[PDB]
Every structure is written in C-alpha cells, then in structure tokens.
C-alpha cells in the first residue's frame, strides 16, 4: 500500500494472508484474501494461476505481521481451490479475477471467531456504493513501486470509488475496464494498492454493513495520476460465489 497507516489485524479481522511453500524451507507471501464464512476465503485467480498446486499454499487468519507470528493466528491448508473458468489477462487487466479457497486446519476445522478473526459481508446481487464513497483497502504489498521487499506490518489506507465513465476515459484505462470491475483512487493520487496487495479487500459500507465491495486486482504503476487501482466487482460475481459456497 502506498500511504496509509500501519494497522493491526483487529482493524481488519477478515483479512487472510496466503503463502506458498518452497522445497528448500522458505514459504513466501503470494496474496491477500478475505474470510466470507468459516471455511471460505475469497482472493484473486491471477494469484494462483502460475502455480495451481493447492497443497503448496498456507492460509493464515489473525496475522498483523508478515514473517513473524501474532498471538491468536490460525494456520490452514487449502482443501479446495476454485479458480474462475473464463479468467483472462491482457496487457494490464485480468478479467473474472476472483477465486475461492476452502480452508481446513490440521485438526479438521475451519476458522473460529476471535477479536482477530471475523468474516466480512458480501453485497447483495449487483448492488454497489455510489462513486465518491470512501472504502478502505488493506494488505502487505509494496510501499513504493521501487521496493523489492514487502513491509512486515499490515497497512491500510482509504481510497474513493470513482465512476466507470471516469475510469474508461481514454487517458485513464479506456475499455480495459469493464462493468465487472470497479476503480477506486485517492483524490490526490497519493495512496493506492500496489504489488503484494492482490486478492485483498476493498471494504465499503453498504446499507449499514462493512461489505467486501472489490478485490485488489491490477492497476498501472501504484498511485500514478489518472491510473486508478482496479478491483473485481464482487456484486457481479455473487452467482458464481454461491455456486461453490452452498
């Protein structure tokens, strides 16, 4: 995240940290994700696309730091990994960039509620906040596009949703952005999501609840002027989500 503040998982108790294990002993961070129900985490298909081997990923809930542990964290194995059939990437955008991971702990259980583990709410079929709404994004991604490491403390920042008309302007993303994506930027292009933030949440309040409105997906550079961040418009994937989380 460029900008933002450092936070603790109690401020984002539905954020999930997904890692991949390597032969050699290292486990590295892959993407962020959010908990929707006790056994399901939702993230982004491009995060798994080049290595769809579910037994090599680890999902942690209750983690405020990236490589050191937090008291209260839970560790899980990926029991099912559902990627999106019709996922495509072009020079910038990813289409249908949503994925579901079913988690199981080594004792056969799913997540348990704590002050550091909570689910986030889903929107109702195709219902979104209006452009202008301030939503918050969180994650362990880069702090400057030139960094080659990720911060060790969880960050969060506030960004506003912008309109498709504004994002589809030729000097922004033109038609690379579709009705299944949302764009959110900082009025003064100061904070935004960046590499390492993919799969984590865009949370806005809808009808009184904190809802997962978008998934960090892509963007050109990080916090660049007229280069909003693009998120998967979760309200338009509710059918797909249900199909697998029934």
């Amino acid at each position: 995240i460029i900008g933002g503040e450092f936070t603790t998982i109690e401020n984002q108790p539905w954020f999930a940290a997904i890692y991949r294990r390597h032969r050699g002993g290292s486990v590295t961070y892959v993407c962020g994700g959010s908990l929707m129900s006790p056994c399901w985490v939702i993230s982004a298909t491009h995060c798994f696309i080049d290595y769809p081997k579910k037994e090599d990923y680890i999902v942690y809930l209750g983690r405020s730091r990236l490589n050191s542990n937090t008291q209260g964290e839970m560790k899980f194995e990926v029991e099912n990994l559902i990627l999106h059939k019709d996922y495509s990437a072009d020079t910038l955008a990813h289409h249908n960039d949503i994925a579901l991971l079913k988690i199981r702990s080594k004792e056969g259980r799913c997540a348990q509620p704590s002050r550091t583990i909570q689910t986030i709410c889903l929107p109702s079929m195709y219902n979104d906040p209006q452009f202008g709404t301030s939503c918050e994004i969180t994650g362990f991604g880069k702090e400057a596009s030139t960094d080659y490491l990720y911060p060790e403390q969880l960050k969060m920042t506030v960004v506003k949703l912008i309109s498709h008309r504004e994002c589809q302007q030729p000097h922004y993303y033109g038609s690379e952005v579709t009705t299944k994506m949302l764009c959110a930027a900082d009025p003064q292009w100061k904070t935004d999501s960046c590499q390492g933030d993919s799969g984590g949440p865009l949370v806005c309040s809808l009808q009184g609840r904190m809802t997962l409105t978008g998934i960090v997906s892509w963007g050109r550079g990080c916090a660049l002027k007229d280069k909003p961040g693009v998120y998967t418009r979760v309200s338009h994937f509710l059918p797909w989500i249900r199909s697998h989380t029934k």
């Binding site: 984002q12 509620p113 689910t119 986030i120 609840r209």
Partner: peptide, 8 residues
C-alpha cells in the same frame, strides 16, 4: 462468540 460479518 459466533461470527457477525462486518464487525470489528
């Protein structure tokens, strides 16, 4: 106790 989606 149980989950209340959205609550901190």
């Amino acid at each position: 106790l149980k989950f209340q989606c959205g609550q901190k």
